Amino acid sequence: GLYVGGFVDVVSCPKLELYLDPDQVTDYLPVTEPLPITIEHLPETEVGWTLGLFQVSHGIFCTGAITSPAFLELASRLADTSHVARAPVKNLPKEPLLEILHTWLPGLSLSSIHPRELSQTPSGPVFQHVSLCALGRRRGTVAVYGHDAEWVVSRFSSVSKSERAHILQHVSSCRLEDLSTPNFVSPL
Ligand SMILES: O=C(O)c1ccc(NC(=O)c2cccc(CC3CCCCC3)n2)c(Nc2cccc(OC(F)(F)F)c2)c1
């Protein structure tokens, strides 16, 4: 069980593309229904689920859980045994897993439909998934990975106490065990 949090970039047709202003989608927030957490908008890389997308003072904040056993075990092995994975991280970190995810997947990209379908009334869901990304971070903040949801939200000074309380209310109400098993498979 691993938690992630941070401010997101809102992209439409990712890697195909248009970055959106957070205000173009605030009318459709919050989103407390689980959305899949994938990697670089790739299919079959679901590693977890969103626990809440909230509009706060300085943009759209995301809190999610990384639940894929295959991904956690693979990432943990690389963090403990790979000189390449540890090259861009400070020497001898206490939590090599967290620091490596923090360094290699800093971006949280929120997938969305085209804006031309938002000015009108959208027919279907506006958001498709959130992605951990190695590139493309603009307005978003570097994703924070940790073991306690409260600890993750604490690392962001851009979130007031009242906001933080609103987040943990919807995060604490979600049990990670009731979530579906992500479909991630190791591409090794
Ligand atoms: O076999 C191949 O041809 C193949 C070769 C390399 C791949 N990855 C990269 O080039 C790449 C680049 C930057 C970041 C990441 C993700 C982190 C994950 C934590 C550990 C550090 C790396 N991956 C992938 N694609 C890939 C898909 C999803 C996850 C992933 O990481 C892992 F496989 F380790 F889970 C790699 C595939």
UniProtKB/TrEMBL annotation:
It comes from the Viruses. The active site is at H41 (charge relay system), S109 (charge relay system), H129 (charge relay system). It is found in: Host nucleus. Exists in a monomer-dimer equilibrium with the dimer being the active species. This is Assemblin. It comes from Human herpesvirus 8.
